[PDB]
Amino acid sequence: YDDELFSDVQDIKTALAKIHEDNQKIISKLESLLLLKGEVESIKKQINRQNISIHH
Amino acid sequence: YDDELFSDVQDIKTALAKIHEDNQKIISKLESLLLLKGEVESIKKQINRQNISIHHH
Amino acid sequence: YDDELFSDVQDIKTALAKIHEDNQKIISKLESLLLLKGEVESIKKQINRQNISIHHH
Amino acid sequence: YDDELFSDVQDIKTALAKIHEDNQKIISKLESLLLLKGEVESIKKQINRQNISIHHHH
Ligand SMILES: [Ca+2]
16 A cells, blocks of 8 residues: 555545535524524514504 | 545545535525515515506596 | 556545535535525515504504 | 655645635635624614614504
8 A cells, every 4th residue: 555545645635624624614604594584574563663664 | 545644634634525515505595585686676666567557647 | 567556546535526516516505505605685674664664653 | 655655645745735725715604694683683683773763653
């Protein structure tokens, strides 16, 4: 083994570690973005509340 | 095919399979986010509905 | 170049191609999502038009 | 270290570099999307302002 297969293999492993870390970052931001769905539901309630007061 | 070399190759295969699984999770979340699109359009209509009510008053 | 080693190397290449394919799908979805920013700005204008409507009475 | 095997290893490296490059772009797009959080918040305030004007208006 090597000559020098081992060094190349290590480099591949180092790259794989970097991509996975990237994935973790991509997932954190998706989770934060998902909170948007609740906010845009809130806007629709806020508009309905306006409609209720105006009717009154 | 040195045994240690095979061990190392198996590790690489294990890493890639994990990355692919993460990709599935990422795509699943994106599909959910896409539904936002319909929700926003509905808000524009809700405002238009409001405008009509105000005119008829 | 051992025959089994070559096959495992081939298996690795197939996996990278699949991950790359996942990437393109992810990018496509994110481009669609970015269209949201224009839609939200449009809502801000639509609400402002209502305000102009109310002032004129 | 067989020369054919070396090419195949180089090929693997090239694909990984390309995937990382894609990862960067995906991240840049997510950061842009995040600014949406502020925009949706701006709308919530804009609606509240209407309610206040209306109260003074009425
Ligand atoms: Ca990704």
